[PDB]
């Protein structure tokens, strides 16, 4: 027997590396500097252990999303003059009228201006007296006039010499052997949607509703859900604002609200009522497999906390809504209509749970309509006394890994090793 | 045809028929330097394997016979239960301890064959 060297054998080892775009008026997620796109092979006899909570494709996607956010915030206006004292009178307790003194293009003169601020942006200091909410411990940098926020599908294509393994099991709860894997050059399209308490536009489970969590017996860990049929939602903002351009320096301009046109009608997002009861009924059937066939599943409303996390906040049309989902989560369960949700708007944003970095979103002249999907929740359990038959699932969320960890629960990146030596009966003369 | 890594679960004997398949898929602002440092790694990683073949003398070949004799203390199974019961993922553990000294006998078995063919030409 004589050693023989083979180059190009199918062996792989776990690894972690850097992935890049591929994606077919500038977007924040700059689809103008990502590679253009272009292939799925079946691996037989193969069984490959997975784990979706010790994934690393997630901790790279959370940093790439943040760092794309605040490079598209650097190059344009910084509104540090707006921290002054306002004299705000009621427009009619929701809108204010808020006139103040602010500079001109001539450094020594002053200007008297005005603008309409929502009540969620001014905190008073004891007409009346007010100031902007993020003025102590933040620095407001206006959003920037010609950049969009709408998500665009991005494919995460791995480098050459690495490969991405995809679990095609149709009931995969993200942990354990997957007897049917594949090999993909790069993923399907993942929309980087920002949301809370309800995952929007999603991607649907194939056969049944799936409940996924890190440590079920622990009550401090969230519980991602994944519907298998969408439950579409309908948002609107009736009023029709006007845009006015304050000038606050040489080459700066502050896009403030002008006048409302009409009566003030609240902004909402409805639901179909009968659909929301079937869907909440298929969740309970699939949620008894993990807690007991004779247990009372009681849904409740938000527990409390910061307004970014006790309410269903999202972003469509360019104007950041903050809806109040209490009528969705109700209805204790034992063994034409529409639900109307009252949504409030803001204009100064603190997105990624950062401290001391904020943003001001210019108004959207026009009427805002919005047609979304609801393809998941993020519940959380309340720890009882282990001697009851009732479980209360309040919606939670906030942490942002949990949105994306619901899309990269099936992928795994590996590293090829193409060199091998084996015995044979050949000899080199 | 089976494709890239298609023969991952097949036996060592029928998965040596698809060496060219993996052999041609090993080379090819936030996105501006994530891109650039990803290519200078796929190349430097690849050139450290085409140099190893050159040292042993197998350059440009996928299957290459050598002169080292298979020591019976590395794996003492017979040929019928290596090329017909194993998969490369299984065979590549069993010699995980003895791969760093097979690479040391292949390297200097060629250095002796360089200075044996060089002398022979002198006559």
């Amino acid at each position, epitope marked *: 027997l004589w050693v023989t060297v083979y180059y190009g054998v199918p062996v792989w080892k776990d690894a972690e590396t850097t992935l890049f775009c591929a994606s077919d008026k500038h977007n924040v997620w700059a689809t103008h500097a990502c590679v253009p796109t272009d292939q799925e092979i079946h691996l037989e006899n193969v*069984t490959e252990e997975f784990n979706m909570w010790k994934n690393n494709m997630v901790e790279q996607m959370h940093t790439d999303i943040i760092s794309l956010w605040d490079q598209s915030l650097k190059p344009c206006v910084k509104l540090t003059p707006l921290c002054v004292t306002l004299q705000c009178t009621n427009v009619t307790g929701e809108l204010k009228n808020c006139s103040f003194n602010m500079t001109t293009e001539l450094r020594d003169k002053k200007q008297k201006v005005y603008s309409l601020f929502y009540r969620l942006d001014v905190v008073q200091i004891n007409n009346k007296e007010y100031r902007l909410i993020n003025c102590n411990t933040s620095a407001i940098t206006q959003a920037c006039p010609k950049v969009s926020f709408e998500p665009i599908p991005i494919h995460y294509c791995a480098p050459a010499g690495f490969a991405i393994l995809k679990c095609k099991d149709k009931k995969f709860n993200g942990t354990g*052997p997957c007897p049917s894997v594949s090999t993909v050059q790069c993923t399907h399209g993942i929309k980087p949607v920002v949301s809370t308490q309800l995952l929007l536009n999603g991607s649907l489970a194939e056969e049944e509703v799936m409940i996924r969590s890190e440590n*079920i017996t622990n009550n401090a860990k969230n519980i991602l859900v994944q519907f298998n049929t969408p439950v579409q939602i309908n948002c609107t903002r009736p009023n029709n604002n006007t845009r006015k351009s304050i000038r606050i320096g040489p080459g700066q301009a502050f896009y403030a609200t002008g006048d409302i046109i009409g009566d003030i009608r609240q902004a909402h997002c409805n639901v179909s009522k009968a659909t929301w009861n079937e869907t909440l009924g298929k969740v309970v059937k699939q949620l008894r497999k993990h*807690f*007991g066939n004779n247990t009372i599943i009681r849904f409740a409303n938000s527990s409390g906390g910061d307004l970014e996390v006790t309410t269903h906040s999202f972003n469509c049309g360019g104007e950041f809504f903050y809806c109040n989902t209490s009528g969705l989560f109700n209805s204790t369960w034992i063994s034409n209509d529409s639900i109307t949700l009252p949504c409030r708007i803001k204009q100064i944003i603190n997105m990624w749970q950062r401290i001391g970095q904020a943003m001001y979103a210019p108004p959207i002249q026009g009427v805002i309509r919005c047609v979304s999907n609801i393809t998941g929740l993020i519940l959380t359990r309340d720890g009882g006394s282990t001697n009851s038959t009732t*479980e209360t699932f309040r919606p939670g969320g906030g942490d942002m890994r949990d949105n994306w960890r619901s899309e990269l629960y099936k992928y795994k990146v590996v590293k090829i090793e193409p060199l091998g030596v084996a015995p044979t009966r050949c000899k080199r003369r | 045809f089976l494709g890239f890594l298609g023969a991952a679960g097949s036996t060592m004997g029928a998965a040596s028929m698809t060496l060219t398949v993996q052999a041609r898929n090993l080379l090819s602002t936030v996105w501006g330097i994530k891109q650039l440092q990803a290519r200078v790694l796929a190349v430097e990683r690849y050139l450290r394997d085409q140099q190893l073949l050159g040292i042993w003398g197998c350059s440009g070949k996928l299957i290459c016979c050598t002169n080292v004799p298979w020591n019976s*203390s590395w794996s003492n199974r017979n040929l019928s239960e290596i090329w017909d019961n194993m998969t490369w*993922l299984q065979w590549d*553990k069993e010699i995980s301890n003895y791969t760093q000294i097979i690479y040391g006998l292949l390297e200097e078995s060629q250095n002796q064959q360089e200075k044996n063919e060089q002398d022979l030409l002198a006559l």
Partner: antibody, heavy 132, light 107 residues
Framework: QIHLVQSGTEVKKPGSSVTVSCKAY?????????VNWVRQAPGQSLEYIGQ??????????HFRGRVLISAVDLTGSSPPISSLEIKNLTSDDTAVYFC??????????????????????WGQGTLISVSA | DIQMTQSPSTLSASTGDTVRISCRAS???????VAWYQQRPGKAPRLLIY???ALLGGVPSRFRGSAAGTDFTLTIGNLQAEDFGTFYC?????????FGQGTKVEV
């Protein structure tokens, strides 16, 4: 951390059946771990009974037909759990019974030779005595 | 099925001594697929060397084993008084993985 807790002491009579269970606190789930049941005759060499691995249990070459290894995964109330019954018990089968688990996530671990395993997290021991 | 005749059947030494323990297979294990335990009286055995010479976490580096052919040997450095007990060499080369017989280390 990982902690293993087996049931308590028990005594039986020949011709009966007895069950011992093992509740593991800290196992992610039995998909990524494997459970092997061993036995130590009084002051003797150890002995291996059976196992569950990737959810397919099997028994040894001297026990087949007289044993049943079963297990159930996580649940909002109890940790993952495994069980062992000994049917047609006899005076020979008195010994201490251990519950053992090994990780099987990493394919290049070295604690498992494609099914045959080394044991890295041991229980506490259950003593089973049969007499009249 | 592999069988191992662990030897010496029992040895004794005091602290500060270097101790070797042998273990022989019946066939050759050419992958270094053996492991070593330690059973204090009554408690449960603790794995401390797997795959020839690899050391689990937490086990002090004072231990060491070697692997060659059919002779597998375990060595203890500068012995310490709580390290008296029993040891076991197990093979996991082929199904099923049998154990040794045990060799106490009395004071």
């Amino acid at each position: 951390q990982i902690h293993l807790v087996q049931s308590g002491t028990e005594v039986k009579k020949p011709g009966s059946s007895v069950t011992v269970s093992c509740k593991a606190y800290g196992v992610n789930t039995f998909g990524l771990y494997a459970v092997n049941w061993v036995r130590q005759a009084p002051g003797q060499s150890l002995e291996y009974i059976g196992q569950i691995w990737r959810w397919k249990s099997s028994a040894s070459h001297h026990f087949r037909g007289r044993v049943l290894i079963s297990a159930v995964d996580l649940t909002g109330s109890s940790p993952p759990i495994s069980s062992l019954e000994i049917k047609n018990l006899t005076s020979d089968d008195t010994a201490v019974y251990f519950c053992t688990t090994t990780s099987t996530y990493d394919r290049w671990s070295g604690l498992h030779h494609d099914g045959v395993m080394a044991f890295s997290s041991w229980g506490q021991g259950t003593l089973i005595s049969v007499s009249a | 099925d592999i069988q191992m005749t662990q030897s010496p059947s029992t040895l004794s030494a005091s602290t500060g001594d270097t101790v070797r323990i042998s273990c022989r297979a019946s066939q050759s294990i050419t992958g270094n697929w053996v492991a070593w335990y330690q059973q204090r009286p009554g408690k449960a055995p603790r794995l401390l060397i797997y795959r020839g010479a690899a050391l689990l976490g937490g086990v002090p580096s004072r231990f060491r084993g070697s692997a060659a052919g059919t002779d597998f040997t375990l060595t203890i450095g500068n012995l310490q008084a709580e390290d008296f007990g029993t040891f076991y060499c197990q093979q996991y080369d082929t199904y099923p993985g049998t154990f040794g017989q045990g060799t106490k280390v009395e004071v």
